Amino acid sequence: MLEKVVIANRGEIALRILRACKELGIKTVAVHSTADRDLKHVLLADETICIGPAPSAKSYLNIPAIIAAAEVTGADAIHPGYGFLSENADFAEQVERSGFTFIGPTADVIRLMGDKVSAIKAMKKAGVPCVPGSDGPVSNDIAKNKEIAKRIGYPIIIKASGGMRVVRSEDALEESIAMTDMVYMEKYLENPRHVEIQVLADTHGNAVYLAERDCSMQRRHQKVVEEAPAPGITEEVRRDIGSRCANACVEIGYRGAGTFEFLYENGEFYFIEMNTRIQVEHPVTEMITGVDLVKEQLRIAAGLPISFKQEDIKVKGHAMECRINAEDPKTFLPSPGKVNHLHSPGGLGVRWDSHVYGGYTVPPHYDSMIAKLITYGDTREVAIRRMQNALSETIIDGIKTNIPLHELILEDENFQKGGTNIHYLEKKLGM
Amino acid sequence: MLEKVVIANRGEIALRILRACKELGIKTVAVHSTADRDLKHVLLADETICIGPAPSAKSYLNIPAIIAAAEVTGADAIHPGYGFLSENADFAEQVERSGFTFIGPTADVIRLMGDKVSAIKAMKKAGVPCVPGSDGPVSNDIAKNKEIAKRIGYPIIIKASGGMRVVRSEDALEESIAMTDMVYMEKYLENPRHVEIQVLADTHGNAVYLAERDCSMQRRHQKVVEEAPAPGITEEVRRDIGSRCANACVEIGYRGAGTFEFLYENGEFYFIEMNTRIQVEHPVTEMITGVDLVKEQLRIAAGLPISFKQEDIKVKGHAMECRINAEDPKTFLPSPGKVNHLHSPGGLGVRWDSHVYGGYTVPPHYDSMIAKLITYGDTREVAIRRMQNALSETIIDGIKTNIPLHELILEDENFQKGGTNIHYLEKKLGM
Numbered sequence A, B: 001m002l003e004k005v006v007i008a009n010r011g012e013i014a015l016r017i018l019r020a021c022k023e024l025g026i027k028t029v030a031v032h033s034t035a036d037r038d039l040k041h042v043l044l045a046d047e048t049i050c051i052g053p054a055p056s057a058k059s060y061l062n063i064p065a066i067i068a069a070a071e072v073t074g075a076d077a078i079h080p081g082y083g084f085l086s087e088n089a090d091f092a093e094q095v096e097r098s099g100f101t102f103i104g105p106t107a108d109v110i111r112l113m114g115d116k117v118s119a120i121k122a123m124k125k126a127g128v129p130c131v132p133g134s135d136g137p138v139s140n141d142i143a144k145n146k147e148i149a150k151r152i153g154y155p156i157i158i159k160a161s162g163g164m165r166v167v168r169s170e171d172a173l174e175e176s177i178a179m180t181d182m183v184y185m186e187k188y189l190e191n192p193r194h195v196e197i198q199v200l201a202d203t204h205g206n207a208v209y210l211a212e213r214d215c216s217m218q219r220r221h222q223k224v225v226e227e228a229p230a231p232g233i234t235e236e237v238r239r240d241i242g243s244r245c246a247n248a249c250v251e252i253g254y255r256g257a258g259t260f261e262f263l264y265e266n267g268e269f270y271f272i273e274m275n276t277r278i279q280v281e282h283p284v285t286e287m288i289t290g291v292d293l294v295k296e297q298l299r300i301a302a303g304l305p306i307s308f309k310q311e312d313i314k315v316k317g318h319a320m321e322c323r324i325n326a327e328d329p330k331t332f333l334p335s336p337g338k339v340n341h342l343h344s345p346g347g348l349g350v351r352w353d354s355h356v357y358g359g360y361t362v363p364p365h366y367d368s369m370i371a372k373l374i375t376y377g378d379t380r381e382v383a384i385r386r387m388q389n390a391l392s393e394t395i396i397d398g399i400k401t402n403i404p405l406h407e408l409i410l411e412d413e414n415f416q417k418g419g420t421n422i423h424y425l426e427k428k429l430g431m
């Protein structure tokens, strides 16, 4: 089975993966760039291998070097984390072709869900609800395009199949479509929330859905605060969309952890993308289900069945996560530098996922996320109050962080009420 | 209701209490000695009041000064934590007599359970199983003492009613009893485990039991590692002893949080003491029940009912706690001093309850406990592996800690098996 895993990533998720491996007695191989020599997980790994210079293109996206590290250590598997090469079908294809287990879905399934209409295509077949659209590429004859558009109802939105332009009136169609590797047409939702379903699927033909997460708080389409379950969603609705996603997994032959992302508006779900990998915000789902998602990833890659059945999963309580970034809380300019003093919060229902430590220098070369603060409570309110308190205890001296932003979000009356849409944060910042 | 609470304690439990207050929007008043000026919770409290010089006798056991602090702030209540004045009936009596709410049981009930035979007396009446004994003070006529002793069966053990000498043969009775403010006789158990039941009781006449904890790993009768639930204990046995403890609460008029400690041997429970207060190791119970014990303490003092019914409580998974002390791991000599670098562990199922921070100096004046590392897993094994991993990530530079001892305990084959008795640790250390 899995005796040694190459952790093809960095930062907090690399540490998350290391922890999961250690608990399973799996040997860890930390591949890192020269600038990541002092990462907490690198310092804890059983074996370390420099795979290149600081720039991502030369290190963490270096496919030849990553596979060479798996080779010279005798690894059985490679965990891509999220981002970087985790949804690169060439990488997964190349990884299997060299005899290693890729901890994720097969290359074909990544290609499938990596192209937008090809994706919406499969979901439709599987019974997964999609946004009313052209259902396929757009013709260039507008006389007919206007029909589909009027059929589904303005506003519509033109979308790149491998990626956006909003159309409000019929008079601006012809042209809006011209402006660009193809494009489809779809209904534009003005007040949607981001709601996503977590799933697991094994090589024994099983598939389970693990409730949902709401990730509506975003800046430039980048998630900032997430929670679970999604407010307003009943156990009945959960079962419906959840079971549809589970079925779709089997229909498309999915394997490992994945997430179906939907736009949620007026009680309707509309599929927009499947992330064929673990997600950053997976911890909130772990808190409310008791499931260890990364451990399940490893078990599944090992050829084992999911370690529980659907009936075993019950939602309990509520969880929140704040992505703590090294950046100016207003300008969002990255703030690299030495952390002179770190104090991380603790206590009942507080979870801290971070690779940062006092004396650690946050490099400029990669993303700005340095920690994920996660809280759990018996209700949504407790989780929020818990988050607020944990944040105020948190010290990170030496650099700027977005903690002040989180504190603003958490004391927001509308966020406290629940159900704010995907536009709300940028709107509050503007105001 | 409760608007402002005076935290009559220090260290980690003071911080625990502060956190619980903050979540409930209760104002906090931190009373501290001069040496505790830099405690994390003092620095977070809404109001601070120096109540005396470093020595405990002059500060944290200073009843006049503590009540004066409650007065000059207008506090409604005083939380005694554990140790210090938490089981001092004079303090609780004096606290109520001055119009403040004492967050704990009434003075009478503390007196009752504070005297050993008077305690065993009540439990017996309530249906709580006690160790076969003289059931009352020992006569001084041995001709009759030998009857009781032979009745219950050697070995027996003589015990101070306000506190021990073991007797193996009849020939050494007369004398063993002479050696001393009274004493009773009791059966001596050679292979017992320490198993204790957590309870809550409110002023609405309700009482609930919250499963049990096993605290068998001890040195000089001081707990080192605790876990929940107690291995080998079935849901059926749990209900039995648990419901007996709940009933006893009502019979004696108990109020707030408390723990019934038993010796557990060959499937039999034998009451030996009730701690009429929160306990250090309460967190492991919180992890397996989802109950916030300190929040319930506060609600109950506020006159509210326990926020859940017995049926709502289900044991799930398993939890472990390691008491991390500033001491030499072999000699157990305290190791006060500056913590130059702190790194606390995190991740799924890891909880860290500590007032320590990088740059903090551990004073000489008080106990050596600086942190409580708590882990949770879906099974006992996962909890243990989780603890082992968390411990290895933990850095505390500047002073000695007992972390090496914990790591020894956790990799012990017998502890891994489960059910080691109260003598096992001192025995392993000896070997």
Ligand SMILES: Nc1ncnc2c1ncn2[C@@H]1O[C@H](COP(=O)(O)OP(=O)(O)CP(=O)(O)O)[C@@H](O)[C@H]1O
Pocket (backbone or CB within 6 Å): A131, A157, A163, A164, A186, A187, A188, A189, A190, A192, A221, A263, A272, A273, A275, A422
């Ligand atoms: N039909 C629709 N109605 C309303 N908003 C839509 C929409 N279609 C797309 N969007 C918006 O565009 C966003 C996604 O854009 P995009 O196609 O570039 O994916 P993305 O890369 O931004 C998210 P990821 O981080 O998973 O890659 C959605 O989050 C949503 O806010």
Ligand SMILES: Nc1ncnc2c1ncn2[C@@H]1O[C@H](COP(=O)(O)OP(=O)(O)CP(=O)(O)O)[C@@H](O)[C@H]1O
Pocket (backbone or CB within 6 Å): B131, B157, B163, B164, B186, B187, B188, B189, B190, B192, B221, B263, B272, B273, B275, B422
């Ligand atoms: N009948 C018995 N059989 C076996 N061991 C016994 C016993 N009675 C007492 N003991 C031992 O003596 C210990 C308790 O001693 P003691 O009466 O001084 O309370 P204590 O102060 O040590 C515990 P606490 O910290 O709650 O005050 C028990 O933990 C147990 O190990």
